[PDB]
Amino acid sequence: LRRLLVWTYDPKIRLKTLAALVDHCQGRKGGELASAVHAYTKTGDPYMRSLVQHILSLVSH
Amino acid sequence: NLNAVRETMDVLLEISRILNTGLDMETLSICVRLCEQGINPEALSSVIKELRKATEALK
Amino acid sequence: LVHRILPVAASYSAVTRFIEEKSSFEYGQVNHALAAAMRTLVKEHLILVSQLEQLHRQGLLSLQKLWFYIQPAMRTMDILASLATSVDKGECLGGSTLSLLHDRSFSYTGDSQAQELCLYLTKAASAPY
Amino acid sequence: SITQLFDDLCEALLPAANRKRAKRSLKKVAYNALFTNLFQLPARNKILMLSFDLRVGGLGPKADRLEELVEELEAVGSVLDLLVQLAGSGPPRDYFLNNKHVGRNVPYSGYDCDDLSVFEMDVQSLISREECLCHSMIQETLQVMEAAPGTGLPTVGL
């Protein structure tokens, strides 16, 4: 419907954090890759505080 | 007596096989040593079946 | 898109050449069990290929479904195609293999996909030792 | 101790391939069932009562052997008392019956056609068993060749 406009609408919003994460951590290594991932967890939205709370759940271990 | 209790251990095996009990040689040795203490065997019949149930509970 | 799918066959080429040769007595008694728990995985590889072909016969396979299917087969077969070309290159006999597999089971401790696989490989290679 | 032999019972009945937390729970299972019966006729007579059902189901020499062994074990009393309570829940030519060609002065009864027909059934059970193996080897593998891919392998979970 609507030539895949509505069907890929929901992924675009999520990609607008995943692209932010790869742009943001560029040129950072080490224990600052626990700081940069924690900083993006705090947004105010559950849709991106259940996505970076999973990336963070992997970087914890 | 050590001659006699090896032969009685061997004859004891056949009547545990043909009565279709779950015991093999190792469990037969465990059970003959356990009954030697003085435990009532009608009680042991339940703990062996409960072990064989809860073993299958894992797999 | 084909060159995205080609890494599966490239990560299959450097697996069977270990199993189908590097297991014999001259090579030690340690290349045996390495080719005795890498063979089960290659059996699994051929299992997956046959299960795909059956769907292809019913008109139910194209490049995209194949592309989704092979991401489990290039996140797992690539681990093997990395380990195999480092154990084979350089004489890894006895404890040197087991140090290399305590180095490449520490290379994955933050992935958690490949860590269990490396532990499985060295838990079969530790048995003759 | 006696409570230590119950750990060895858990050791034989569960082999190792986790495997350090299951054995204490099975040890609990071994202890918890022993004392419920303790809160709440000879021995060889039950052997005869079980040899009877054998003879009802045919198979003569097996009953003749079961009675043969308890007769010489009376010529360990508490361990056969366990076997009669564990019965029937575990895992389980000759040319002198219907072949009268061998022997010395063989018994004269005329002929046979009524046990010679149950001498083919003695092989027919084997012929019916060794085809059930190949039914259960083609089935376990057609359960692999036909499925949606990777639902019998955890490789999709990698």
Side-chain angles (χ1 to χ4, degrees), chain B residues 40-59:
Chain B
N40 191 61
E42 276 82 30
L44 304 165
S45 324
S46 88
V47 299
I48 297 173
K49 293 177 179 184
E50 288 316 299
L51 206 180
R52 285 192 299 166
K53 186 64 183 76
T55 280
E56 302 178 5
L58 295 170
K59 317 182 291 190

Side-chain angles (χ1 to χ4, degrees), chain B residues 8 11-12 14 16-21 23 30-32 34 41-43 45-47 49-52 54-55 58, chain D residues 9 13 22 26 29-30 33-34 37 62 65 69 73 76 78-83 85-92:
Chain B
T8 200
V11 66
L12 201 53
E14 193 185 312
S16 48
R17 178 58 49 154
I18 67 177
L19 272 176
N20 200 1
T21 73
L23 310 186
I30 309 289
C31 88
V32 298
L34 188 48
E42 276 82 30
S45 324
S46 88
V47 299
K49 293 177 179 184
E50 288 316 299
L51 206 180
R52 285 192 299 166
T55 280
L58 295 170
Chain D
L9 284 149
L13 261 174
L26 290 194
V29 172
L34 163 67
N37 63 273
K62 177 40 57 200
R65 181 78 160 176
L69 258 57
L73 203 50
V76 78
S78 191
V79 68
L80 188 44
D81 277 11
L82 186 49
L83 304 176
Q85 295 300 300
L86 296 170
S89 89

Side-chain angles (χ1 to χ4, degrees), chain D residues 52-77:
Chain D
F52 183 71
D53 300 326
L54 302 173
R55 291 165 204 260
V56 169
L59 53 94
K62 177 40 57 200
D64 305 322
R65 181 78 160 176
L66 173 57
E67 282 186 30
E68 191 174 309
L69 258 57
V70 58
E71 192 73 87
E72 69 173 339
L73 203 50
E74 205 167 86
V76 78

